[PDB]
Amino acid sequence: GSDDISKLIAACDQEPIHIPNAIQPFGAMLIVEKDTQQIVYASANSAEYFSVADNTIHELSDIKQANINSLLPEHLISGLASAIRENEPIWVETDRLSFLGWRHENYYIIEVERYHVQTSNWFEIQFQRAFQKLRNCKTHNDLINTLTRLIQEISGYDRVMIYQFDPEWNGRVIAESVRQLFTSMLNHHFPASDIPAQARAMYSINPIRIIPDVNAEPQPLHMIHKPQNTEAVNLSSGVLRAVSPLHMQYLRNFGVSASTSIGIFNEDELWGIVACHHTKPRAIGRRIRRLLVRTVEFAAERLWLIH
Ligand SMILES: *C/C=C1/C(=C/c2[nH]c(/C=C3[NH+]=C(/C=C4\NC(=O)C(C=C)=C4C)C(C)=C\3CCC(=O)O)c(CCC(=O)O)c2C)NC(=O)[C@H]1C
């Protein structure tokens, strides 16, 4: 039936991806009522992240006891309080932990990750080399190929592609960089339903989406202290937001174990994405994420100017 097939296609765009009440297990998440300053939701894995800074905490139970001010660094709490704008993430890096938090209505949402030892000035020197290569490009075809190659080198993903939307949100792959033999994806077309409108809109909130392992077990948000409002909390601005299992299976069918995509914007208009696949699971720290986003933004700026 024709209208039935259309119902099914329309269901794609209606899965509530913004409120899964779970996360990917490469970080831990705390949800805290702003006025109560009380921990109301915590990921089922919070223990193994806050046990790195605080040794009193070894179980999810201990988080009901825990105070925010022992768990979170002070600059994080001060920035989150002194922040008026909703959904704009603050980042605070201790000696052991990398925090990203933001305010959404009466909720503070805090994501915490681990990180590797860093090399000073590496972020900036890498961006400098990308800035110079993208700026020396004089046609869009050199620009986009250069972009895929740089994203490939910075991230180390097995495959980096530029996926360009047409006026109806259908898209095609227009450039490719690979770390191994692959059958070409060049000029392969995909329908608009493969990235439903809700996912397309998510790049306007967080321009990078990151999936380190398609088979990693999502961790649900447990209730800690009974929140005033039991509505689902919107997790859109972070990176830990659990992945729609449909898209996980889509990645498996692709032969992919890790994914990362970055929106390509012209002003507020989503023009396309950088799509990144890995055959084995892969994680990339916050600094590689920010470098990728910043590289894509400079490439976009160049893309709208050159012929
Ligand atoms: C009925 C629903 C469907 C559906 C849902 C869905 N898809 C995403 C997210 C993404 N889909 C992407 C598609 C592509 N990746 C590629 O490499 C290519 C072509 C080479 C395409 C077309 C991409 C890139 C994303 C972003 C995530 C990522 O980078 O992997 C979501 C959002 C999931 C989430 O963000 O939690 C949803 C709900 N896909 C379908 O095919 C139908 C069945």
Side-chain angles (χ1 to χ4, degrees):
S2 169
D3 295 4
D4 305 307
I5 304 172
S6 283
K7 318 268 198 176
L8 295 192
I9 300 179
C12 284
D13 291 56
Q14 300 290 341
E15 181 197 8
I17 72 174
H18 60 294
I19 47 149
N21 298 351
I23 63 165
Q24 309 181 69
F26 68 97
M29 167 175 284
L30 296 182
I31 309 190
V32 168
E33 286 202 347
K34 175 194 182 71
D35 43 16
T36 321
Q37 275 182 302
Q38 218 193 10
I39 291 172
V40 302
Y41 292 107
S43 45
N45 69 330
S46 294
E48 49 156 305
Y49 280 92
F50 295 95
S51 55
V52 171
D54 188 335
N55 269 351
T56 79
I57 313 292
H58 321 112
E59 283 199 345
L60 185 67
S61 301
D62 307 1
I63 310 165
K64 216 202 284 275
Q65 269 58 65
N67 188 303
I68 288 149
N69 300 267
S70 46
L71 291 184
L72 310 181
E74 184 185 9
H75 278 293
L76 176 65
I77 318 178
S78 96
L80 288 168
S82 76
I84 311 182
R85 205 101 64 185
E86 269 185 89
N87 289 91
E88 254 184 327
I90 281 163
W91 157 79
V92 174
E93 195 190 71
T94 77
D95 64 322
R96 302 140 173 282
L97 291 182
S98 197
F99 289 92
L100 187 91
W102 71 93
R103 73 164 301 260
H104 178 74
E105 303 172 351
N106 193 34
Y107 293 95
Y108 286 122
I109 308 201
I110 304 97
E111 303 184 333
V112 48
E113 298 181 28
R114 315 282 300 285
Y115 66 110
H116 290 304
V117 57
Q118 316 264 282
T119 301
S120 272
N121 302 335
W122 176 89
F123 182 103
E124 295 88 355
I125 284 156
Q126 286 303 319
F127 181 72
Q128 195 60 41
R129 284 163 192 187
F131 170 90
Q132 224 69 47
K133 268 169 173 188
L134 296 167
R135 225 194 53 182
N136 276 348
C137 289
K138 297 177 181 175
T139 47
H140 57 270
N141 185 249
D142 291 345
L143 193 89
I144 71 178
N145 293 336
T146 299
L147 171 57
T148 63
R149 198 174 75 97
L150 286 165
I151 296 294
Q152 154 80 56
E153 289 171 1
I154 292 153
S155 72
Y157 274 68
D158 287 325
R159 188 158 51 188
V160 179
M161 292 169 303
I162 306 309
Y163 182 79
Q164 197 189 350
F165 296 111
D166 69 22
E168 310 296 318
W169 304 109
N170 290 311
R172 93 184 187 289
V173 178
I174 69 179
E176 223 184 341
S177 272
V178 296
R179 215 173 64 86
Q180 68 165 71
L181 277 182
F182 273 118
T183 50
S184 183
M185 287 289 105
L186 195 77
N187 298 313
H188 281 50
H189 284 253
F190 293 84
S193 54
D194 286 16
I195 326 183
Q198 35 177 196
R200 267 179 269 124
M202 204 67 81
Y203 296 108
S204 292
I205 306 179
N206 194 332
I208 186 160
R209 176 66 160 145
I210 197 161
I211 300 179
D213 182 17
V214 306
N215 297 319
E217 183 57 34
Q219 310 282 340
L221 297 179
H222 288 291
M223 193 165 300
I224 299 309
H225 290 135
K226 289 196 173 190
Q228 319 181 47
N229 179 26
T230 57
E231 282 193 19
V233 194
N234 180 16
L235 311 178
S236 285
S237 298
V239 301
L240 293 185
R241 177 176 54 84
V243 185
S244 167
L246 201 47
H247 177 62
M248 297 297 226
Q249 186 53 45
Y250 178 98
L251 290 179
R252 295 188 196 101
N253 303 339
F254 231 132
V256 175
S257 300
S259 191
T260 285
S261 53
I262 301 145
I264 305 172
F265 285 98
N266 183 337
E267 275 214 38
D268 271 21
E269 179 81 353
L270 179 63
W271 179 93
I273 67 172
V274 179
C276 301
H277 297 154
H278 214 62
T279 61
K280 318 162 182 167
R282 182 159 185 82
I284 48 176
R286 293 203 200 277
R287 278 201 171 80
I288 289 178
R289 287 172 237 176
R290 292 296 293 101
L291 185 50
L292 295 171
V293 174
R294 204 170 162 69
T295 299
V296 172
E297 291 164 340
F298 184 64
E301 177 182 277
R302 300 305 293 163
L303 189 53
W304 321 139
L305 274 294
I306 77 187
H307 300 283

